Amino acid sequence: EFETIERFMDCRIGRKGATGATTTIYAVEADGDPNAGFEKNKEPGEIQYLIKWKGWSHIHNTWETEETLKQQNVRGMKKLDNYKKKDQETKRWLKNASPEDVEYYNCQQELTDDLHKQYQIVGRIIAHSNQKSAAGYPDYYCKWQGLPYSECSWEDGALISKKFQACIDEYFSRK
């Protein structure tokens, strides 16, 4: 306490209030998207940013506005200015570019976009906890798709099982 910006993964406009815990993949699979079905064409959302947090896997990323950040008193604020300055610099250098340049930028960015989504999925469970929740779930050491083992981390047993039961059944299956 308190939390720290590690990396800005993305940028969007969405429903005002569609920020925070309710905005994780797990929260969203369980309960639905607070940004439900947001047409740029409900009252303009706000500029919202997808945040990757210090000491927390990508599974736990949240969408946050300049204001929630300031509100939640997080550290790494400097990084919101660079992200913006940098975002502006890109746009300016791409106002007039071939359609080729613009084409390249959209593929070469769909690539990453998709890449980053993989960090949120477990490609292998490698260890579990000797202690268990009251519900009787152990925690799992997870190997995430797309990232080195130095990025493995311990995920809540219930959290995982909701989506990666297969990885779980498979880990125990290899005994």
Partner: peptide
């Protein structure tokens, strides 16, 4: 342990 499961 530790989720955001508000």
């Amino acid at each position: 342990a530790r989720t955001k499961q508000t």
